[PDB]
DNA sequence: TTGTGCTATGATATTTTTATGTATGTACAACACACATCGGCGTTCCATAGCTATTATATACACAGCGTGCTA
């Protein structure tokens, strides 16, 4: 990819003594850039990752290059260990395993052999936006190499600590514009859209009488959000496109999941059921609407479903939802003549959550994506299958929300 | 004088996910007495070769049955 050689030209310029951060999309090949840099340096390279799936991907890249089984390419994890050799090495480690404090499973010595014997020379950190934390400062404080590299896709955080990475690892060298990359490769056009649904009177006065995170249980459970949600679901099913529903709250995800009758993936869920739901979403055309929480978004991103719906949200964590949204957008690439990606933000008027979703839309403006407002698409008035459209169901839902407030 | 409001820290309240020690399900073999071993056939069809009854005649000998005399 041209931008990858545009990033490698900086390494080809000076050669020795260099450190910086390279911003590349998730769908791009930053791991290939790490492989090329590993071929240019030829030394013990350590790749800092947070999940085993990324370790398996880096191992697959090592297989795409050459060798992995002979005593040279090592693997560090809490399950097994593998030997290494000087002058050339490729190993992937976990942040929580290298960090620690005093808990030990007779494996911290195996890491202190890679760090004690001084077999290093190249540092690779996956997702640098997570570095602003004490454990990563300890990791950097326990390592020292000749060349450092930071592979990440985003860096927008409101912790005011992203600027420290300019001296902890190095200043950002190349930031690729996702619009020009969309022109190089169709990574699904980004259509940002907020749905403005009216707010009922009872949920408005009860919403004002509530506060903190409890008023979210009155912002999400609005009947017009169920009507507009069903209208968007039936609309996308009529267009023949799969639907992914995001929710920062597990309770709302279970409510919409059970009321819509679709599979759901949330916390404390068996992994076999998660894999079954994933296979049903990949193969079965009857399941075109999945309800995914943060566990289903951080662990895996699927290239299907051009329809992304956002209902639940948390205060301040708008940039993280923009990063996950960006992961689902960049995950969809196949060079199509159309390829229209639709992001809907179900927001209710006069609520305290839309005013942060606007900050998320500001993050979506900083990336160059297109944003437009949507009050209501004509067609919901012709859907007799809408729930909570009658005053009876609205009063019953009001009583259910009041009971939910009495439980919390 | 006493009550009320913002900066900042202090503490208090949520959320996701790594491995870990204990629990649960499932193998394995296996220990040492409990026990074991040892000894100083019936039934039917076809080709085969022997084997059945008879006599003309002499000789002599034994065996079973019948016709006639005597007396009680």
UniProtKB/Swiss-Prot annotation:
Disruption phenotype: Essential, it cannot be deleted; epistasis studies suggest it is involved in damaged DNA excision repair.
Subcellular location: Nucleus
Positions where Phosphoserine occurs in the chain: 390
Occurrences of domain Helicase ATP-binding (ranges): 11-173
Motif DEAH box per UniProt: ranges: 126-129
Domain of life where this protein originates: Eukaryota
Amino acids binding ATP: 24-31
Domain (Helicase C-terminal) ranges: 227-381
Consequence recorded when altering residue 127 to Q: Loss of DNA translocase function of TFHII
Family classification: Belongs to the helicase family. RAD25/XPB subfamily.
Extra information: Present with 825 molecules/cell in log phase SD medium.
The protein's role, per its UniProt record: ATP-dependent DNA translocase. Component of the general transcription and DNA repair factor IIH (TFIIH) core complex. When complexed to CDK-activating kinase (CAK), involved in RNA transcription by RNA polymerase II. May have 3'-5' helicase activity alone, the TFIIH core however has no 3'-5' helicase activity. Also involved in transcription-coupled nucleotide excision repair (NER) of damaged DNA. In NER, TFIIH acts by opening DNA around the lesion to allow the excision of the damaged oligonucleotide and its replacement by a new DNA fragment.
Oligomeric form and interacting partners: Component of the 7-subunit TFIIH core complex composed of XPB/SSL2, XPD/RAD3, SSL1, TFB1, TFB2, TFB4 and TFB5, which is active in NER. The core complex associates with the 3-subunit CTD-kinase module TFIIK composed of CCL1, KIN28 and TFB3 to form the 10-subunit holoenzyme (holo-TFIIH) active in transcription. An additionnal subunit, TFB6, plays a role in the dissociation of the SSL2 helicase from TFIIH after transcription initiation. Interacts directly with TFB6.
Protein known as: General transcription and DNA repair factor IIH helicase/translocase subunit XPB/SSL2
Residues of the full protein shown: 363 to 770 of 843
């Amino acid at each position: 990819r041209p931008y990858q050689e545009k990033s490698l030209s900086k390494m080809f310029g000076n050669g020795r003594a260099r450190s910086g951060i390279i911003v590349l999309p998730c769908g791009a090949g930053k791991t290939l850039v790490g492989i090329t840099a590993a071929c240019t340096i030829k030394k013990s390279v350590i790749v800092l990752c947070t999940s085993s799936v990324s370790v398996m991907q880096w191992r697959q890249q090592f297989l795409x290059x050459x060798x992995x089984x002979x005593x040279x390419x090592x693997x560090x994890x809490x399950x097994x260990x593998x030997x290494x050799x000087x002058x050339x090495x490729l190993v992937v480690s976990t942040y929580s395993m290298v960090a620690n404090x005093x808990x030990x499973x007779x494996x911290x010595x195996x890491x202190x052999x890679x760090x004690x014997x001084x077999x290093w020379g190249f540092i690779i950190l996956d997702e640098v936006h997570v570095v602003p934390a004490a454990m990563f400062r300890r990791v950097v404080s326990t390592i020292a190499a000749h060349a450092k590299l930071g592979l990440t896709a985003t860096l927008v955080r409101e912790d005011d600590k992203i600027g420290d990475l300019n001296f902890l690892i190095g200043p950002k060298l190349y930031e690729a514009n996702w619009m020009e990359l969309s022109q190089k490769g169709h990574i699904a056009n980004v259509q940002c859209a907020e749905v403005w649904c009216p707010m009922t009177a009872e949920f408005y006065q009860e919403y004002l009488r509530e506060t903190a995170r409890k008023r979210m249980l009155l912002y999400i459970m609005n009947p017009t959000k169920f009507q507009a949600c069903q209208f968007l679901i039936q609309y996308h099913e009529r267009r023949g496109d799969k639907i992914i529903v995001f929710s920062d709250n597990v309770y709302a995800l279970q409510e919409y999941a059970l009321k819509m009758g679709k599979p759901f993936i949330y916390g404390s869920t068996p992994q076999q059921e998660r894999m079954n739901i994933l296979q049903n979403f990949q193969y079965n055309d009857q399941i075109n609407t999945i309800f995914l929480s943060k566990v289903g978004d951080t662990s895996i991103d699927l290239p299907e479903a051009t329809c992304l719906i956002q209902i639940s949200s948390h205060y301040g964590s708008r940039r993280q939802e923009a990063q996950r949204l960006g992961r689902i957008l960049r995950a969809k690439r196949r060079n199509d003549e159309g390829f229209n990606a639709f992001f809907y933000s179900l927001v209710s008027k006069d609520t305290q959550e839309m005013y942060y979703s606007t900050k998320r839309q500001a993050f979506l403006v900083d990336q160059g994506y297109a944003f437009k407002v949507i009050t209501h698409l004509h067609g919901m008035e012709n859907i007799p299958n809408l729930a909570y459209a009658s005053p009876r169901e609205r009063r019953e839902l009001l009583q259910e929300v009041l009971l939910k407030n009495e439980e919390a």
